[PDB]
Amino acid sequence: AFSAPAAYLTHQQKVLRLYKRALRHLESWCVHRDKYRYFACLMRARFDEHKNEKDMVKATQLLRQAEEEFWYGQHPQPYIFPESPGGTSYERYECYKVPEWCLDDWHPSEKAMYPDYFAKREQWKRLRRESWEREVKQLQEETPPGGPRTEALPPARKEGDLPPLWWHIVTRPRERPM
Amino acid sequence: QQERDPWYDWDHPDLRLNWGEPIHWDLDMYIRNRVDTSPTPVSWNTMCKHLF
Amino acid sequence: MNPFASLTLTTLTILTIPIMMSNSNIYKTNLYPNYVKTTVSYAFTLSLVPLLMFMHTGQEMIISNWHWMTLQTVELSLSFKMDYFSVMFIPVALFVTWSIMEFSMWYMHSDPFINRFFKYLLLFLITMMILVTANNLFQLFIGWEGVGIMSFLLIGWWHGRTDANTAALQAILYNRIGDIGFVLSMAWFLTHSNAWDLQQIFMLNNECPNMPLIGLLLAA
Amino acid sequence: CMHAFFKAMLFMCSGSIIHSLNDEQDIRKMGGLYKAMPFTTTALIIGSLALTGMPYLTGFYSKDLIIEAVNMSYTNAWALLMTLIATSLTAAYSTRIIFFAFLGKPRFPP
Amino acid sequence: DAPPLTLEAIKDRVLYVLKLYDKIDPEKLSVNSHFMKDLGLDSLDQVEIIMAMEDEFGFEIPDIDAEKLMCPQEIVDYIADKKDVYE
Amino acid sequence: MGAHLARRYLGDASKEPDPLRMPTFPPDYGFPERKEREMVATQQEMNDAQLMLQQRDYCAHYLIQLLKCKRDSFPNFLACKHEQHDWDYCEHLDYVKRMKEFERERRLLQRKKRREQREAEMARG
Amino acid sequence: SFPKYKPSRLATLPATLDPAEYDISPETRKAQAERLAIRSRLKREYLLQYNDPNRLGVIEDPALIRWTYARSANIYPNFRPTPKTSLLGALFGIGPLFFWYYVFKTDRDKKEKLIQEGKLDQTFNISY
Amino acid sequence: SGYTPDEKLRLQQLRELRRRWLKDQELSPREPVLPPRYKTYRHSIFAVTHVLIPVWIIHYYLKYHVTAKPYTVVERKPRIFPGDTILETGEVIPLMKEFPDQH
Amino acid sequence: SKMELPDYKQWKIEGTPLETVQEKLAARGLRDPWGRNEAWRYSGGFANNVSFVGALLKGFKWGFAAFVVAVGAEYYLESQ
Amino acid sequence: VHIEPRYRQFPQLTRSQLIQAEFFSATMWFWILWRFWHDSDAVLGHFPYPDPSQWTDEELGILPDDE
Numbered sequence A: 001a002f003s004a005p006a007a008y009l010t011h012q013q014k015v016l017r018l019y020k021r022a023l024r025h026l027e028s029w030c031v032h033r034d035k036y037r038y039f040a041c042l043m044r045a046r047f048d049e050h051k052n053e054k055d056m057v058k059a060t061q062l063l064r065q066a067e068e069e070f071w072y073g074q075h076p077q078p079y080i081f082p083e084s085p086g087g088t089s090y091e092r093y094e095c096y097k098v099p100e101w102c103l104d105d106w107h108p109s110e111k112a113m114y115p116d117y118f119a120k121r122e123q124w125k126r127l128r129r130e131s132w133e134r135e136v137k138q139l140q141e142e143t144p145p146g147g148p149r150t151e152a153l154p155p156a157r158k159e160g161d162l163p164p165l166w167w168h169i170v171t172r173p174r175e176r177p178m
Numbered sequence B: 001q002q003e004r005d006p007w008y009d010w011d012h013p014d015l016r017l018n019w020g021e022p023i024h025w026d027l028d029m030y031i032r033n034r035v036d037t038s039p040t041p042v043s044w045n046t047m048c049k050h051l052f
Numbered sequence C: 001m002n003p004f005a006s007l008t009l010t011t012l013t014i015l016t017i018p019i020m021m022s023n024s025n026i027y028k029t030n031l032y033p034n035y036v037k038t039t040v041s042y043a044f045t046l047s048l049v050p051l052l053m054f055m056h057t058g059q060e061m062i063i064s065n066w067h068w069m070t071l072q073t074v075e076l077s078l079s080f081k082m083d084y085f086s087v088m089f090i091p092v093a094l095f096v097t098w099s100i101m102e103f104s105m106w107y108m109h110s111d112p113f114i115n116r117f118f119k120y121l122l123l124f125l126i127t128m129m130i131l132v133t134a135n136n137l138f139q140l141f142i143g144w145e146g147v148g149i150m151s152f153l154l155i156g157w158w159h160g161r162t163d164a165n166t167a168a169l170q171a172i173l174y175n176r177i178g179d180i181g182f183v184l185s186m187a188w189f190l191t192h193s194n195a196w197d198l199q200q201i202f203m204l205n206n207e208c209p210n211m212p213l214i215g216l217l218l219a220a
Numbered sequence D: 001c002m003h004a005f006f007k008a009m010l011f012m013c014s015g016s017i018i019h020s021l022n023d024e025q026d027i028r029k030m031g032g033l034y035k036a037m038p039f040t041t042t043a044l045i046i047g048s049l050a051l052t053g054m055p056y057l058t059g060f061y062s063k064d065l066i067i068e069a070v071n072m073s074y075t076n077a078w079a080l081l082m083t084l085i086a087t088s089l090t091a092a093y094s095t096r097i098i099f100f101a102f103l104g105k106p107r108f109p110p
Numbered sequence E: 001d002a003p004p005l006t007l008e009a010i011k012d013r014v015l016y017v018l019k020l021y022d023k024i025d026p027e028k029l030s031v032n033s034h035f036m037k038d039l040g041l042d043s044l045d046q047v048e049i050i051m052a053m054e055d056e057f058g059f060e061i062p063d064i065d066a067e068k069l070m071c072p073q074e075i076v077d078y079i080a081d082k083k084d085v086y087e
Numbered sequence F: 001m002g003a004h005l006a007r008r009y010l011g012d013a014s015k016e017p018d019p020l021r022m023p024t025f026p027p028d029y030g031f032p033e034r035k036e037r038e039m040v041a042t043q044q045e046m047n048d049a050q051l052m053l054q055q056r057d058y059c060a061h062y063l064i065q066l067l068k069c070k071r072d073s074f075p076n077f078l079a080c081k082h083e084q085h086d087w088d089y090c091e092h093l094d095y096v097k098r099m100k101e102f103e104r105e106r107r108l109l110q111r112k113k114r115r116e117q118r119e120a121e122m123a124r125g
Numbered sequence G: 001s002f003p004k005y006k007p008s009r010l011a012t013l014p015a016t017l018d019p020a021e022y023d024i025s026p027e028t029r030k031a032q033a034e035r036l037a038i039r040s041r042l043k044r045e046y047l048l049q050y051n052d053p054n055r056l057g058v059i060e061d062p063a064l065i066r067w068t069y070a071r072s073a074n075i076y077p078n079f080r081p082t083p084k085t086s087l088l089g090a091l092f093g094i095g096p097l098f099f100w101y102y103v104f105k106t107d108r109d110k111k112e113k114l115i116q117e118g119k120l121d122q123t124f125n126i127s128y
Numbered sequence H: 001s002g003y004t005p006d007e008k009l010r011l012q013q014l015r016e017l018r019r020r021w022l023k024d025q026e027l028s029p030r031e032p033v034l035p036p037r038y039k040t041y042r043h044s045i046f047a048v049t050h051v052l053i054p055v056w057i058i059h060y061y062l063k064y065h066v067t068a069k070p071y072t073v074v075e076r077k078p079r080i081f082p083g084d085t086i087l088e089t090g091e092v093i094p095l096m097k098e099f100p101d102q103h
Numbered sequence I: 001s002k003m004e005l006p007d008y009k010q011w012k013i014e015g016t017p018l019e020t021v022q023e024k025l026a027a028r029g030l031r032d033p034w035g036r037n038e039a040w041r042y043s044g045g046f047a048n049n050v051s052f053v054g055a056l057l058k059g060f061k062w063g064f065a066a067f068v069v070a071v072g073a074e075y076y077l078e079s080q
Numbered sequence J: 001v002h003i004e005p006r007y008r009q010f011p012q013l014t015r016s017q018l019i020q021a022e023f024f025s026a027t028m029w030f031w032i033l034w035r036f037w038h039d040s041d042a043v044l045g046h047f048p049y050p051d052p053s054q055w056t057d058e059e060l061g062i063l064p065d066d067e
């Protein structure tokens, strides 16, 4: 989520993702911890057996057959963490996330109810306003003429600058806002 | 959009859409609140045969 | 007057009372859940009394307090049927709701809208009581759809959860098929019996037919 | 009436389990709760016994009479057989809940 | 509800898990030790370490982000940033 | 549930009774002098007691007595055991009467089958 | 070996089971790079507008505008009378009308015939 | 494989900014500056209003308004058993006949 | 406040099904390195747990004693 | 009461909850045994089920086949 994706997954990345998914589904099948440890050791033994293979075509064929085996033997109801996309507690607190632009539409009485918070908020707003030109200049200087080849973003190269395109990442709502 | 990747930082996280990318003609029915086409552990024909 | 009717209607009204206080400083404070729970407990005892009245002599009544409208030869009035089913299910439901509300006072402590949660629970309780005590088909349908919409609102409690919204709309869809059956039954009963009340329906339908009974079965 | 009682209590027990384990609703991650949570354990055991028709609990006075009426009437044979199998499966899933939620070793985060 | 996390608590828990890993020597394990450059592990070992951390903290780290956590300090910073821990 | 179902379905339904048509023999067939059943409770008494139409059987007097006992000793809901047992015993006797009727129908049907088989054999011979 | 999984329209084919996922030509990699470049360009434009401090309003989406325009206003100008469109329109627009007309006409004719023959149960039917 | 130097540096800077932002999100000891403007007693006040007033109102409504038109409130007639005394007329409903008692 | 993590050296797979798993894997020629991280679950207050039949009979010992006492009291009262 | 969280250890239990759980389990078992002692006909039945094979043809009104 925090990392910019690449154009494709390498063979190492594919096999590692298959390894993690197979281990998780095996844990779903093997509920108890000792049984899961035993069968996970056997699974890693299989992966180690096929670890050293010079023939990339054969390695890809092994990966494909392993993927078919995983799809046949996957748990119909695999365990999902509550906050994970398939989880039960997924997106439950999205209705509680409110942004700071909505925060600055408050009435003067509401703002007066929090005098110290809004002073620091004004400091943050000044920091945002005093850096946008430097950020856009840095972005347009470092980009290739063809355009952005990837979604990655650069850091601040100067002692007094900020990383470009930082405001919403830094001021995103808390994971438990209310 | 259910088939679309949940771990990607979409511009519209709930709809799983980016700004500027082409919108499917049937987005109104393929939203996560509506018809799903994601793969299932059992084949569709097998499921139909078993249920019937 | 017999205390039976007074106490039953008092239980229903005191159930409805805290909703009127949802526009008040008590609703703005943190004492609202305890207030609603206390009201439900008092209603439970006040409904226990008519249960004792019934279990002694088997007292059953119908109360048509308010007349709504007369469609020529059909009269619709706000009528309640206080029989064995009602006087037995009301105290059980009130006891269960009291326990659930205390469990929710513990369980939903971190919810920013715990007051609204308790208001919705009390509204569901009111609609379910309307459904149970309803004496005619229109009031029964009022309770029917009231509990349906309260279920829809409470399933989708976390509005940012797409799965919650899907579940709420799915419940609405299936209950609307049931309501198709319910409306079929209501239309048949009115057309063939000139009534929507249980007394005249029972009097005139000595051999009830497949169309109304299948409508009722589909709704159920 | 009887089902309202014991099913409401069972749902409350499961909710207490969920809250105590940080919003975890998976019996594959529950475990050890028989001694970890005494009162919810005894309450859920009593509810499951009442649900399955323990000979003198709240579910006995309704389910037992219902089964007797089904067996003794001019009923559909397939309906009667399915009712009996459903009673057996009721016992089965109550055992599943108890076994995977309360017995054994912990499977929740440290 | 639950007590809030702290940077020290996160670091202690991740070092606890790593010291309970058998392939890592507890004596030479520091918070800046690299999993493959100076700890001598490999990709499957790192995947299992990330899975152990997921089990420890009760949340999932996506594969796109988990491949880059090659250091206990990196894992601590990732978890603190995701859980909004600043102290 | 019972062996009668097996006999009728996987066997001779002609010899087994028909529950929806029973009885198919005259009540005096085989009984020289048979006594009509005695009803204790009157129609007006049952109407006043408001017995359910299903409960207005030949055991209605015991049910009326049980209801009167329950109403009078209301707070003590455990004081009607003898009346409850009397009602249950009357219902048990009615049920065994029904069972006797079923068995009589079954053996009358099989006796008729034996008689018709004997007549057919005599006609053939 | 293991039983094969048959994709459907409402149960699609997973990526890990796609045969083309394991036959990657060097041109496939450059196609993926071009797609990533397009996505990165659009993302950069959107993020610049989104993080602009002086922006107050809605970042207009030409993709959304095109979708809403093609769904409503671009349909008739690109519609041609073809045998397929003619038959589908005739069926879906006329057939149901005649079907329901026949159903209701038959039902009402039977009811009126019963009324005239005087063997329809109309007791207590007071409201109409 | 791992972070590039640019990715690591940007993550470090963003994390520092985010931590400072949350620290600013913390409140002050006096921050919620509000504008100027026994247990049994509460139960007693709750009971008189919430229970006593509605029962008064509903009893008044039923006795004098609802039970002023016919058939608005209909009670099922009480069950009359043999060997009883109807109180309306001092009547004695007789007992049932002698049972054919068994055992 | 400020809870302290118990010393990590106390966690051992000995006297635990994890050592049986380790022996099976050693016979296979393999090893599992995450033994202790799961061995926290088999020691301490989680060491012993009841069976399914034992769980159902949680309060039978006191229940039967109270039942016997009540039956004796009822018998004495009926006799007197 | 404040229950301090445990790390990889059994939670801190309370004497009150322990005794309450034990009391209610004992209450359930006492109720079951007490009800079974008094009214066991609710489980084992109250009246015998007659055997129709032992009912005589004379009392069932069945005449001899030859007659």
Ligand SMILES: CCCCCCCC/C=C/CCCCCCCC(=O)OC[C@H](COP(=O)(O)OCCN)OC(=O)CCCCCCC/C=C/CCCCCCCC
Pocket (backbone or CB within 6 Å): B032, B033, B034, B035, B036, C163, C166, C167, C169, C170, C171, C173, C177, C180, C217, C218
């Ligand atoms: C009498 C007329 C009606 C008869 C039935 C007509 C069926 C028409 C179906 C409705 C069309 C749907 C339009 C849009 C509905 C809302 C959008 C939608 O598709 O919601 C999908 C939503 C989400 O799916 P999930 O399982 O929750 O997966 C979520 C994963 N994250 O699922 C639904 O709610 C759709 C359910 C529709 C059921 C359709 C068939 C219903 C069965 C009817 C026949 C059975 C009759 C019963 C006989 C009773 C015997 C007396």
Ligand SMILES: *P(=O)(O)OCC(C)(C)[C@H](O)C(=O)NCCC(=O)NCCSC(=O)CCCCCCCCCCCCC
Pocket (backbone or CB within 6 Å): A011, A012, A015, A022, A025, A026, A029, A046, A047, A050, A051, A052, A053, A059, A060, A062, A063, A066, A067, A069, A070, A073, A074, A075, E042, E043, E044
């Ligand atoms: P680290 O960076 O050292 O990783 C080393 C890797 C693996 C990247 C190697 O350098 C490598 O690329 N080796 C050659 C490619 C290769 O290893 N291919 C084989 C991969 S798949 C394999 O052979 C193992 C699959 C067997 C297990 C399949 C699991 C299916 C069962 C799951 C069922 C679900 C419930 C149990």
